[PDB]
Design a protein around this ligand. Structure first.
Ligand code: CHL
Ligand code: CHL
Ligand code: CHL
Ligand code: CHL
Ligand code: CLA
Ligand code: CLA
Ligand SMILES: CC(/C=C/C=C(C)/C=C/[C@@]12O[C@]1(C)C[C@@H](O)CC2(C)C)=C\C=C\C=C(C)\C=C\C=C(C)\C=C\[C@@]12O[C@]1(C)C[C@@H](O)CC2(C)C
Ligand SMILES: CC1=C[C@H](O)CC(C)(C)[C@H]1/C=C/C(C)=C/C=C/C(C)=C/C=C/C=C(C)/C=C/C=C(C)/C=C/C1=C(C)C[C@H](O)CC1(C)C
Ligand SMILES: CC1=C[C@H](O)CC(C)(C)[C@H]1/C=C/C(C)=C/C=C/C(C)=C/C=C/C=C(C)/C=C/C=C(C)/C=C/C1=C(C)C[C@H](O)CC1(C)C
Ligand SMILES: CC1=C[C@H](O)CC(C)(C)[C@H]1/C=C/C(C)=C/C=C/C(C)=C/C=C/C=C(C)/C=C/C=C(C)/C=C/C1=C(C)C[C@H](O)CC1(C)C
Ligand SMILES: CC1=C[C@H](O)CC(C)(C)[C@H]1/C=C/C(C)=C/C=C/C(C)=C\C=C/C=C(C)/C=C/C=C(C)/C=C/C1=C(C)C[C@H](O)CC1(C)C
Lengths: 222, 214, 118, 221, 217
C-alpha cells in the first residue's frame, strides 16, 4: 500500500510514467514524485530525505504552536493580548511585562530578547550539533534520522510492522503540516489577520471571503 | 546539422571553444554549451531538466502571445495581462473579444474547478499516455500533436526542434520581462513599448524608475 | 463588425450596398446580375468534373498546400475533420435560422438575449 | 593537516562528521555540505568556481560599498551620493558622475555609454577568464597566476595552498557582509557605516530586534 | 471489511447472529434481514435490484430537490418554484416552466405533453434497461457498464468491488434523506434547505421538538 512496487503514487492512476526509477518504494512517503530529478543521486536523495523529516517535524510543532495561543485566547486562558496570533506573538517580548507564559506574569516574565537569543543559540546549537555528530551521551540507536533509543521513551518503535506504518504516518502528518505552515505564512502576509480568523471569514461567506477576494491586493500601480 | 555536433554554435561565441561542459556534446536541440553551473551533470537530472525547459518554453510561447493580443485589440479595452484576471469580478464578467454573450463568465470558483479537472486529465495524459497517444516521446509525441506532419523528415524535425526551443527561450526571457516590467512600470508590455518608441531617451527603465528602485 | 443581424443585413445591403461600413461603388441591380453570373460560372466549372471522388475533393488549385492530396492516413483524418466541421455547421446554421424565426435576433443577438434571460 | 587533510578544522568544530566527497582536498573545506548539493563531482567543481568568483567580487564589493561612505563621513571627499545603494543614481544628477567629486575625473554623463562599454569590456574580460585570452591560455581557471601574480606571492606551493584558504575565508566573510549590507539597506534604508555609527552610539536601542523586528508584522516601519 | 464473513455488520459488535443466506459476496451487506424477507434466493436477487434502483433514483432525487432551492436562496438563479414539493405547480403559471428561470429554456406550457413525453421516453428507457437496446445488451441488470461506464472508473475488478459498496452506502443515505424530505415537507411547509438554515440559526428552538410535534398530537 505505502511500500513496495505497487505502492500509493502522487498522480494516482496517471503515475506509472511519472515514477523516477531511483524511487522504488523503500523509504517512507515514496509516492514517486521527483519530476525535477533533484534526488537522482543516491547521496543527494539521502540528504534531502533527512532534511524533509527535520522540516516535517519542525512544521508539525509549528502548526500547534501557531494556533494554541489563539485557541486559548478565543476560549480558555484568554491572556495573550495580540500575542495569540503567531505573527504578532514575538513582539510581546517588548511589552511592559514582556513575554508572559500563558499570559501569566509569574511565568517566565521574559523582557530581554538578547538573553533569549543567547539561551536558544547554546541550547539549539548543542542539540543540532549532536544530531549532526550522529553520536551523543543519550541513546542514539544507530540511526541519525530516526534515533529511537532515548528520544522514544514510550517504546512505540518496538516492532518494525508498526514502525513502517508509523514512519509513513509521521511524514504524511508532517508533509500536511509543512504544506499548512506554508499556508499560514502566505495567508498571514496577504490577509494580515490570524489564521483561525481567516477560517471564520471563509465560513461566513465562502464565495465572497476567499483567496480571490484579495486578488488585486498586490497589483503594481502606474 | 549546424545546430548539432561539436561544431555547433555556443552561447559565448568565439570565447566558448575551450569552455564546454563535458555532458553537453551536441545531441539535443538548443545546445549552446551553457551549463556553467553544476546542474545537469548527472544524465538523469539533465534528461528531466531538458523536458522542463521545453514545457516552460511551450507555456511561455503561449503566454507571450496571450499577454499581448488582448492588450493590442480593442473591445478587450486593451487590458494589461496582469489586470485581466480581475475582470471576472466585474459586473459584465469575461466576454471574449469584448463581444457580449460569448462566455459571460462571472464565477472564479467555477472557472478554477473546470480548469483543475480538465488540466489534471490533460497533464495526466501527457505523463502516463492516454487517448491522444500512448508509448510516444514524452516531449515530442507527434501523431495527434503533429497533424500537418510538418516534422515527418527526421532531419526537418531536428531543425524544427531547434526552432521550437530557440523561440521558446526567447519567449521565456521576454515573459520574465513582462513580469518585471509590470511590477516596475505598472503598465502592460505594449504600453511600455509604445512609450519607448515615442521618446526613447526619456521613456526607458533608467530615466524613469531606476532611481526609485532603491 | 457592423452590429447588424445576419437576417437584417440582407435588406440593409439591398437598400444600400456596403461592406464593413464602406459603401460599395455598385448599384444593387448590377450586383444582383453579377452575383447570379459569377455564381453561375463558378458552379458550371465545378460540374465539369467526371470523377466522383474528384467532385468531392478536386485538389489541384484548391489544395495549394498539398495537405490531403495523397492517400495517407493524414488525408483520411483531415477528411474526417472536414465532414465533422461540416455537419456541425449545417446543424449550427439551422440553429441560426430557427433562432431568428423564434427569438427574432441573429447569432450574437440570440447569445446575448439568452444570457440576459436569466 | 592544519587546513587541508583529515585533521582540517570543521564548521561545527568538535561535533563534526565531514561528507565522504569532502576529503579536505580544496581550500575552505570545513566539511559543510549538509544539503548534499555537491555530491556529484562535476557539480562540486562548478560550485567551487562560483564560490571563488563570488568571493572575489564580494571582497571588491564590500570594500567599494563603504569607501565612498567612509570618505564622505570623515569629510575626506563629497560625493553626489556616497551611500552604496544610491551611487548608481549619480549619473542622473545635474553634472553627471564625477569621481571623488572632482569634475575633472571621469565626468560621465550618459548611462547608455556606461552600459555599452561595460558589456563590451566585461564581455571580453569574462571571455578571457573562461576560454583564455591575452594574459594566457591554459592557466588554472580559478588561479591563473602568471600575469595575475606579478608579485609572485604564490611561487612557494605550501604558501600558495595556505593563502588560497585565506582568500576564501576573507571572501566568505565578504559575501556574508554584502548580504548584510543589502538586508540592512532594505530595512534601515541607511548606509552600512551609518548603521554601525547608530549601533555604537546606542547598541541597546538601535539593534534590529529593538527598532524593526517589533514592526515587521502589522505595524509597518 | 465489506465482503466475506468478516464484513462489518449493521448492529456492530452486538450483531451476533446473522441470517445464513445473508453472507458476503454482495455490496452493502451488513447482515440486516431481521424480517427474513430475502430468505428465498430468487427474492433476494430481485430485492437487491430494487434496492440499487431505488437508491440510484434517490441519489438523483436528493441532489435534484436541493439544487434549485440552494441556487434560489444563494442568489445564483431565480426559479418559479424552488421548493421541490411545489416545483410541479410551475406548469400552472403564466409563463409555464422555464429552466433556471430563463424564458428561452424548455419553456414548457402543457402538463399533458410533459406527461405524454415522459411516458413514452421512460417506457422505452425502462424497457431498454430490462431487455437491452441502443445503449447496450443486458448482462448485469443493475451493473451494465460499457456504454454506461465511458470513463472506466470500474475497469479494475478490485475497484469495482469497493465502488459498488460506495454506491449502495451513498444510495442508502440518499433514500433515508429523501424519506426525510417527504416527512419534513409535510410537518414543515418550508423547503428542506430552509429547514437546515433554521436549525443552524437556533437549533435549541428550531427543531422537530420545541415546534410542531405537539401539533401533530
Ligand atoms: C545529546 C543530546 C541531545 C539532545 C538534548 C537532543 C534534543 C533534541 N533532539 Mg536530538 N538531541 C540530542 C542528540 C541527538 N539527536 C539526534 C538526532 C535527532 C533527530 C533526527 C531529531 C532530533 C530532535 C531533537 C529535538 C526533539 C525532542 C525530542 O527528543 O523528541 C523526541 C521525544 C519526544 C517528542 C530535541 C530538542 C528532533 C528535532 O530536531 O525536532 C524538530 C529530530 O527530529 N535529534 C542525534 C543523532 C543520533 C543525536 C546524537 O547525539
Ligand atoms: C563548537 C560549536 C559550533 C557550532 C554550534 C557552530 C555553528 C555554526 N557554524 Mg561553526 N559552529 C561551531 C564551531 C566552529 N565553527 C568553525 C568554523 C565555521 C565556519 C568557517 C563556518 C561556520 C559556520 C557555522 C554556522 C553554519 C550555518 C548553519 O548550520 O546554520 C543553522 C542555523 C540555524 C538553523 C539557526 C540558528 C539559530 C539562530 C541564529 C537564532 C553555524 C550556526 C558557517 C557560517 O554560517 O559562518 C557564519 C561557516 O561558514 N563555522 C570553527 C573553527 C574551525 C569552529 C570551532 O569550534
Ligand atoms: C551586482 C551588481 C549591481 C547591484 C547589486 C546593483 C544594485 C542596485 N543598483 Mg545598479 N546594481 C548593480 C550594477 C549596476 N548598476 C548600474 C547602474 C545603476 C543605476 C543608474 C542605478 C542603479 C541602482 C541600483 C539600486 C536600485 C536597483 C535598480 O534599479 O537597479 C538598476 C540596475 C542597473 C541599472 C544595472 C543592471 C544590471 C547590471 C548591468 C548587471 C551587470 C552584469 C552584466 C553587465 C549583465 C549581463 C547580462 C540597487 C541597490 C539605482 C540606484 O542607485 O537607486 C538609488 C539607479 O538609479 N544602478 C550599472 C551600470 C549600468 C551596473 C553595472 O554593473
Ligand atoms: C558625456 C560627457 C563627458 C565629459 C564632458 C567627460 C569629460 C571627461 N572625461 Mg569622461 N566625460 C564624459 C563622459 C564619460 N566619460 C566616461 C569615462 C571616462 C574615463 C574612463 C575617463 C574619463 C575622463 C574624462 C576627463 C578627461 C579629461 C582630462 O582630465 O584630461 C587630462 C589630459 C589627458 C587625458 C591627455 C590629453 C587628452 C586630449 C583628448 C588629447 C588627445 C587629442 C587627440 C589628438 C584627439 C583624439 C584622437 C587621436 C588620439 C587620434 C574629462 C573631464 C578621464 C579622466 O577622468 O581623466 C582624469 C578618464 O580616464 N571619462 C564615460 C563612461 C564610458 C562617460 C559616459 O558618458
Ligand atoms: C497559456 C496561454 C493563455 C492563457 C493562460 C490565456 C488566458 C486568458 N485569456 Mg488568452 N489568448 C492566448 C493565450 C492564453 N490566454 C493566445 C495565444 C491568444 C491569441 C489567439 C489569446 C487571445 C485572447 C483574447 C482575444 C482574449 C483572451 C482572453 C483570456 C482570459 C479569459 C479567456 C476566456 O474568456 O476563457 C477562454 C477562452 C475561450 C474558451 C475561447 C472561446 C472561443 C471564442 C470565444 C470563439 C471565437 C470568437 C467568436 C467567433 C466570436 C463570435 C462573434 C465574433 C465573430 C464577432 C484569460 C485569463 C479574453 C480576455 O478578455 O482576457 C481577459 C480575451 O478576450 N485571450
Ligand atoms: C540596500 C539596497 C536596496 C534598498 C535600500 C532598496 C530599497 C527599495 N527597493 Mg530595491 N532592489 C535592490 C536593492 C535595494 N532596494 C536590488 C539590488 C535590486 C535588484 C534585484 C532591487 C530591485 C527592486 C525592485 C524591482 C523594486 C525595488 C523596490 C524598492 C523600494 C520598495 C518599494 C515597496 O516595496 O514599497 C511599496 C511598493 C511599491 C512602491 C510598488 C513598487 C525600496 C525603497 C520597489 C520599488 O522600486 O518601488 C517603487 C520595486 O519595484 N527594488
Ligand atoms: C489542484 C488542486 C487539487 C487537486 C485535488 C486532487 C489531486 C485530488 C485528490 C484525490 O487524490 C485524493 C487525495 C484521493 C484520490 O483517491 C481522489 C482524488 C480526488 C484524486 C487544487 C488547486 C487549488 C487552487 C486554488 C484554489 C488556488 C487559489 C488561488 C488564489 C486564490 C490566488 C489568489 C492570488 O494569486 C492572485 C490571483 C494574485 C495574487 O497577487 C494574490 C493572491 C491572493 C495570492
Ligand atoms: C542555462 C543555464 C546553465 C547554468 O548551468 C545555470 C543557469 C545559468 C541557472 C541556467 C540558466 C537558466 C535560465 C536562464 C532559466 C530561465 C528561466 C525562465 C525565465 C523561465 C520563464 C518562464 C515563464 C513562463 C513559463 C510564462 C508563463 C506565462 C503564461 C502561461 C501566461 C499566462 C496568462 C496569459 C497568456 C494572459 C493573462 O492576461 C494573464 C495569464 C493568465 C497569467
Ligand atoms: C556551504 C553550504 C552547504 C549546504 O549543504 C547548502 C548550503 C547551506 C546552501 C551552503 C551554503 C551556501 C551559502 C552560505 C551561500 C551564500 C552566498 C552569498 C551571501 C553570496 C554573496 C554574494 C555577494 C556578492 C558577490 C556582492 C557583490 C557586490 C559587488 C560586486 C558591489 C558592487 C558595487 C560597489 C562596489 C559599490 C556601489 O555603490 C554599488 C555597486 C556598483 C553595485
Ligand atoms: C434492510 C431491512 C431488513 C429487514 O428486511 C427489515 C426491513 C426494515 C424491511 C429492511 C429495511 C428496509 C428499508 C430501510 C427500506 C427503506 C426504503 C426507502 C426510504 C426508500 C426511499 C426511496 C426514495 C426515492 C427512490 C426518492 C426518489 C426521489 C425522486 C424521484 C425526486 C423527484 C423530484 C425532484 C428531484 C425535484 C422535483 O421538484 C420534485 C420531483 C420531480 C418529485
Ligand atoms: C516533491 C517535489 C518533486 C519535484 O520533483 C521537485 C520539487 C517540486 C522541488 C519537490 C517539492 C518539494 C516541496 C513541496 C517542498 C515544500 C516545502 C514547504 C511548503 C515547507 C517546508 C518546511 C516548512 C516548515 C519546516 C515550517 C516551519 C514553521 C515553524 C517551525 C513555526 C514557527 C513559529 C511558532 C511555532 C510559533 C510563532 O508564534 C510563530 C513562528 C516562529 C513562525
Amino acid at each position: 500500500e505505502f511500500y513496495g512496487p505497487d505502492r500509493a503514487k502522487w498522480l494516482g492512476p496517471f503515475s506509472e510514467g511519472s515514477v523516477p526509477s531511483y524511487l522504488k518504494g523503500e523509504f517512507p512517503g515514496d509516492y514517486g514524485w521527483d519530476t525535477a530529478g533533484l534526488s537522482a543521486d543516491p547521496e543527494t536523495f539521502a540528504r534531502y530525505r533527512e532534511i524533509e523529516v527535520i522540516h516535517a517535524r519542525w512544521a508539525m510543532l509549528g502548526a500547534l504552536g501557531c494556533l494554541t495561543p489563539e485557541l486559548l485566547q478565543n476560549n480558555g486562558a484568554a491572556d495573550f493580548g495580540e500575542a495569540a496570533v503567531w505573527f504578532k506573538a514575538g513582539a510581546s517580548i517588548f511589552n511592559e511585562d514582556g513575554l508572559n507564559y500563558l499570559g501569566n506574569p509569574s511565568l517566565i516574565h521574559a523582557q530581554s530578547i538578547v538573553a533569549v537569543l543567547l539561551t536558544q543559540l547554546v541550547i539549539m546549537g548543542a542539540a543540532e550539533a549532536y544530531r549532526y555528530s550522529g553520536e551523543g551521551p543519550v541513546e542514539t540507536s544507530g540511526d541519525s534520522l530516526y534515533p529511537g533509543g532515548f528520544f522514544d521513551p514510550l517504546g512505540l518503535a518496538d516492532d518494525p510492522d508498526t514502525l513502517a506504518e508509523l514512519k509513513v504516518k509521521e511524514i504524511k502528518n508532517g508533509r500536511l503540516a509543512m504544506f499548512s505552515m506554508f499556508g499560514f505564512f502566505v495567508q498571514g502576509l496577504v490577509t494580515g489577520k490570524s489564521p483561525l480568523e481567516n477560517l471564520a471569514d471563509h465560513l461566513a461567506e465562502p464565495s465572497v471571503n476567499n483567496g480571490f477576494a484579495s486578488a488585486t491586493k498586490f497589483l503594481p500601480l502606474p | 546539422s549546424q545546430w548539432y555536433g561539436p561544431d555547433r554554435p555556443k552561447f559565448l561565441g568565439p570565447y566558448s571553444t575551450n569552455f564546454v561542459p563535458s555532458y553537453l556534446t551536441g545531441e539535443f536541440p538548443g545546445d549552446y554549451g551553457w551549463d556553467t553551473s553544476g546542474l545537469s551533470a548527472d544524465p538523469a537530472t539533465f534528461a528531466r531538466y531538458r523536458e522542463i525547459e521545453v514545457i516552460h518554453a511551450r507555456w511561455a510561447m503561449l503566454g507571450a502571445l496571450g499577454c499581448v493580443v488582448p492588450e493590442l485589440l480593442d473591445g478587450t479595452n486593451h487590458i494589461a495581462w496582469f489586470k485581466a484576471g480581475a475582470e471576472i469580478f466585474g459586473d459584465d464578467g469575461i466576454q471574449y473579444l469584448g463581444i457580449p454573450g460569448l462566455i459571460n463568465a462571472k464565477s472564479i470558483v467555477a472557472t478554477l474547478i473546470v480548469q483543475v479537472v480538465l488540466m489534471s486529465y490533460v497533464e495526466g495524459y501527457r505523463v502516463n499516455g492516454g487517448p491522444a497517444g500512448t508509448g510516444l516521446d514524452a516531449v515530442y509525441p507527434g501523431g495527434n500533436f503533429d497533424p500537418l506532419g510538418l516534422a515527418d523528415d527526421p532531419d526537418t524535425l531536428a531543425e524544427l526542434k531547434v526552432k521550437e526551443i530557440k523561440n521558446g527561450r526567447l519567449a521565456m526571457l521576454s515573459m520574465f520581462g513582462f513580469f518585471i516590467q509590470a511590477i516596475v512600470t505598472g503598465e502592460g508590455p505594449i504600453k511600455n513599448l509604445n512609450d519607448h518608441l515615442a521618446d526613447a531617451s526619456a521613456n526607458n527603465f533608467y530615466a524613469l524608475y531606476a532611481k526609485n528602485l532603491a | 463588425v457592423t452590429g447588424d443581424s445576419w437576417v437584417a443585413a440582407q435588406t440593409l445591403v439591398y437598400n444600400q450596398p456596403q461592406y464593413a461600413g464602406i459603401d460599395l461603388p455598385f448599384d444593387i441591380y448590377t450586383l444582383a446580375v453579377l452575383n447570379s453570373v459569377l455564381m453561375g460560372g463558378v458552379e458550371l466549372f465545378r460540374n465539369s468534373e467526371l470523377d466522383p471522388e474528384r467532385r468531392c475533393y478536386p485538389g489541384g488549385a484548391f489544395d495549394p498546400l498539398n495537405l490531403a492530396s495523397d492517400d495517407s492516413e493524414r488525408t483520411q483524418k483531415l477528411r474526417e475533420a472536414e465532414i465533422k466541421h461540416a455537419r456541425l455547421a449545417m446543424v449550427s446554421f439551422l440553429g441560426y435560422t430557427v433562432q431568428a424565426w423564434y427569438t427574432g435576433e441573429g447569432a450574437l443577438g440570440s447569445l446575448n438575449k439568452f444570457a440576459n434571460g436569466f | 593537516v592544519e587546513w587541508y587533510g583529515p585533521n582540517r578544522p570543521q564548521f561545527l568544530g568538535p561535533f563534526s562528521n565531514p561528507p565522504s566527497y569532502l576529503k579536505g582536498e580544496f581550500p575552505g573545506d570545513y566539511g559543510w555540505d549538509t544539503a548534499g548539493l555537491s555530491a556529484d563531482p562535476e557539480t562540486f567543481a562548478r560550485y567551487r568556481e562560483l564560490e571563488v568568483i563570488h568571493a572575489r567580487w564580494a571582497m571588491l564589493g564590500a570594500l567599494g560599498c563603504v569607501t565612498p561612505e567612509l570618505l564622505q563621513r570623515n569629510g575626506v571627499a563629497n560625493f553626489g551620493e556616497a551611500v552604496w545603494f544610491k551611487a548608481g543614481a549619480q549619473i542622473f544628477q545635474e553634472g553627471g558622475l564625477d569621481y571623488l567629486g572632482n569634475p575633472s575625473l571621469i565626468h560621465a554623463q550618459s548611462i547608455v555609454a556606461i552600459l555599452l562599454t561595460q558589456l563590451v569590456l566585461m564581455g571580453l574580460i569574462e571571455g578571457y577568464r573562461v576560454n583564455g585570452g591575452p594574459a594566457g591560455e591554459g592557466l588554472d581557471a580559478l588561479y591563473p597566476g602568471e600575469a595575475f601574480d606579478p608579485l609572485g606571492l604564490a611561487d612557494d606551493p605550501d604558501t600558495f595552498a595556505e593563502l588560497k584558504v585565506k582568500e576564501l575565508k576573507n571572501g566568505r566573510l565578504a559575501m556574508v557582509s554584502m548580504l548584510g549590507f543589502g538586508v540592512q539597506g532594505l530595512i534601515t534604508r541607511k548606509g552600512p557605516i551609518e548603521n554601525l555609527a547608530d549601533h555604537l552610539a546606542a547598541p541597546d536601542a538601535t539593534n534590529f530586534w529593538v527598532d524593526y523586528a517589533p514592526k515587521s508584522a502589522g505595524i509597518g516601519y
